[PDB]
Scaffold this active site. Structure first.
Site, mmCIF file in Angstrom:
data_model
loop_
_atom_site.group_PDB
_atom_site.id
_atom_site.type_symbol
_atom_site.label_atom_id
_atom_site.label_comp_id
_atom_site.label_asym_id
_atom_site.label_seq_id
_atom_site.Cartn_x
_atom_site.Cartn_y
_atom_site.Cartn_z
ATOM 1 N N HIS A 43 38.179 37.505 8.642
ATOM 2 C CA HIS A 43 39.464 37.216 8.020
ATOM 3 C C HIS A 43 40.059 38.382 7.236
ATOM 4 O O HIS A 43 41.254 38.389 6.934
ATOM 5 C CB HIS A 43 39.372 35.984 7.116
ATOM 6 C CG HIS A 43 38.718 36.245 5.802
ATOM 7 N ND1 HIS A 43 37.371 36.048 5.588
ATOM 8 C CD2 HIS A 43 39.223 36.706 4.635
ATOM 9 C CE1 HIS A 43 37.075 36.376 4.343
ATOM 10 N NE2 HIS A 43 38.182 36.779 3.744
ATOM 11 N N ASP A 99 32.967 33.806 10.535
ATOM 12 C CA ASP A 99 33.788 34.768 9.805
ATOM 13 C C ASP A 99 33.043 36.117 9.693
ATOM 14 O O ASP A 99 32.504 36.464 8.638
ATOM 15 C CB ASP A 99 34.101 34.206 8.412
ATOM 16 C CG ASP A 99 35.177 34.991 7.694
ATOM 17 O OD1 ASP A 99 35.795 35.877 8.330
ATOM 18 O OD2 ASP A 99 35.407 34.712 6.496
ATOM 19 N N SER A 198 35.874 39.286 -0.919
ATOM 20 C CA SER A 198 35.838 38.817 0.460
ATOM 21 C C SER A 198 35.433 39.940 1.427
ATOM 22 O O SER A 198 35.886 41.072 1.298
ATOM 23 C CB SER A 198 37.232 38.255 0.799
ATOM 24 O OG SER A 198 37.474 38.233 2.187
HETATM 25 C C1 LIG Z 1 39.607 34.135 3.170
HETATM 26 N N1 LIG Z 1 39.595 33.064 2.158
HETATM 27 C C2 LIG Z 1 38.995 33.128 0.948
HETATM 28 C C3 LIG Z 1 38.214 34.306 0.382
HETATM 29 C C4 LIG Z 1 37.340 33.863 -0.766
HETATM 30 C C5 LIG Z 1 35.948 33.923 -0.641
HETATM 31 C C6 LIG Z 1 35.133 33.499 -1.692
HETATM 32 C C7 LIG Z 1 35.691 33.011 -2.873
HETATM 33 C C8 LIG Z 1 34.832 32.559 -3.950
HETATM 34 N N2 LIG Z 1 33.495 32.464 -3.764
HETATM 35 N N3 LIG Z 1 35.363 32.185 -5.138
HETATM 36 C C9 LIG Z 1 37.079 32.953 -3.005
HETATM 37 C C10 LIG Z 1 37.902 33.378 -1.954
HETATM 38 N N4 LIG Z 1 39.196 31.971 0.310
HETATM 39 C C11 LIG Z 1 39.918 31.166 1.096
HETATM 40 C C12 LIG Z 1 40.400 29.879 0.921
HETATM 41 C C13 LIG Z 1 41.153 29.247 1.925
HETATM 42 N N5 LIG Z 1 41.437 27.900 1.767
HETATM 43 S S1 LIG Z 1 40.399 26.591 2.277
HETATM 44 O O1 LIG Z 1 39.322 26.432 1.334
HETATM 45 O O2 LIG Z 1 41.099 25.344 2.363
HETATM 46 C C14 LIG Z 1 39.783 26.982 3.846
HETATM 47 C C15 LIG Z 1 38.423 27.215 4.040
HETATM 48 C C16 LIG Z 1 37.945 27.542 5.309
HETATM 49 C C17 LIG Z 1 38.830 27.638 6.385
HETATM 50 C C18 LIG Z 1 40.192 27.407 6.194
HETATM 51 C C19 LIG Z 1 40.670 27.079 4.922
HETATM 52 C C20 LIG Z 1 41.414 29.924 3.104
HETATM 53 C C21 LIG Z 1 40.922 31.239 3.280
HETATM 54 C C22 LIG Z 1 40.176 31.858 2.274
#
Ligand SMILES: Cn1c(Cc2ccc(C(=N)N)cc2)nc2cc(NS(=O)(=O)c3ccccc3)ccc21
Lengths: 252, 10, 27
Positions: A43, A99, A198
């Site tokens: 991603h 991912d 990330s």
């Molecule tokens: C790349 N990415 C990330 C990076 C990310 C990774 C880790 C953390 C953390 N540990 N706090 C915080 C952010 N967060 C996301 C949050 C979402 N929203 S979600 O949680 O609804 C989701 C999860 C999995 C697939 C699609 C959407 C979508 C993409 C995301």
């Protein structure tokens, strides 16, 4: 990283910074696994929902860094990308399943006291270390709060959580290619990855051969360090097959 | 707030 | 990689960092 602390110099010689050329900015975390291959989250390169689809020339890889914003002369080494490889079954549409992505550097980077590859686990190492309670280490120059910018690479140790708990904490469909880590609400301690971390590495030090192994990749999380929420990571070993093919195929 | 990097890499 | 996972400033000179023992104790 939220609730972590400054990394010691050379503490994470395999930490790689994904840097955007225009505008110059932190793009993601990543890891050095050989003199020409960098591992990171798919991603970080491809993610339509947020209008993200970088190509080789838009990216730059910074290795051997400690400071976030400063150009560390005579220490860090900046590499250009030759080719990006994203897992063929990477599900960015639903849950970021698989991912993971590889980046081949144009020229091999010179190892040093601040630049050194991390190991990719084998079935046995994964089997004996990837257990609930066992702690891993996550590093990055990401945000310090959900909503803030660190001066120095941050680091935090976090416990792997039981799969049931991980699933019961979100509405997102969890897969075997994912695992979650973090402290439960009652455990008292806290900490988590966050925006900017990330693509970064989740490493563990084998007590069997005293070597560092990257078991996961910072994949996704709902907010940062929220009670009841956990960070989710790509299960490196379960995708090592793909890693092998790429490297034993286009790999120099 | 990222310090300028040698333009050679650009 | 034959040298993978062994840090020049730590494992290579047998110095441990400030929190790796937290990891070992969890195993
Ligand atoms: C790349 N990415 C990330 C990076 C990310 C990774 C880790 C953390 C953390 N540990 N706090 C915080 C952010 N967060 C996301 C949050 C979402 N929203 S979600 O949680 O609804 C989701 C999860 C999995 C697939 C699609 C959407 C979508 C993409 C995301």
């Amino acid at each position: 990283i939220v609730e972590g602390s400054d990394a010691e110099i050379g503490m994470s010689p395999w930490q790689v910074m994904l840097f955007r050329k225009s505008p110059q900015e932190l793009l993601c975390g990543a890891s050095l696994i050989s003199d020409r291959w960098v591992l990171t989250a798919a991603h970080c390169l491809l993610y339509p929902p947020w209008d993200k689809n970088f190509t080789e020339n838009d990216l730059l890889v910074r290795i051997g860094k400690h400071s976030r914003t400063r150009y560390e002369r005579n220490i860090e080494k900046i590499s250009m990308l030759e080719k990006i490889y994203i897992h063929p079954r990477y599900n960015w549409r639903e849950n970021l399943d698989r991912d993971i992505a590889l980046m081949k550097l144009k020229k091999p980077v010179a190892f040093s006291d601040y630049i050194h590859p991390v190991c990719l686990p084998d079935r046995e190492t994964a089997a004996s270390l990837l257990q609930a309670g066992y702690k891993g280490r996550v590093t990055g120059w990401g945000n310090l709060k959900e909503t803030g910018q660190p001066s120095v690479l941050q680091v935090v140790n976090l416990p792997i959580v039981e799969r049931p708990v991980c699933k019961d904490s979100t509405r997102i469909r969890i897969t075997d290619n994912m695992f979650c880590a973090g402290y439960k609400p009652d455990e008292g301690k806290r900490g988590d990855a966050c925006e900017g971390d990330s693509g970064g590495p989740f490493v563990m030090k084998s007590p069997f051969n005293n070597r560092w192994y990257q078991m996961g990749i910072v994949s996704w999380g709902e907010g940062c360090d929220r009670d009841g929420k956990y960070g989710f990571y790509t299960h490196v070993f379960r995708l090592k097959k793909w890693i092998q093919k790429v490297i034993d195929q286009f790999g120099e | 707030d990222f310090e300028e990097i040698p333009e050679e890499y650009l | 990689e034959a040298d993978c996972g062994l840090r020049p400033l730590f494992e290579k000179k047998s110095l441990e960092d400030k929190t790796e023992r937290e990891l070992l104790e969890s195993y």
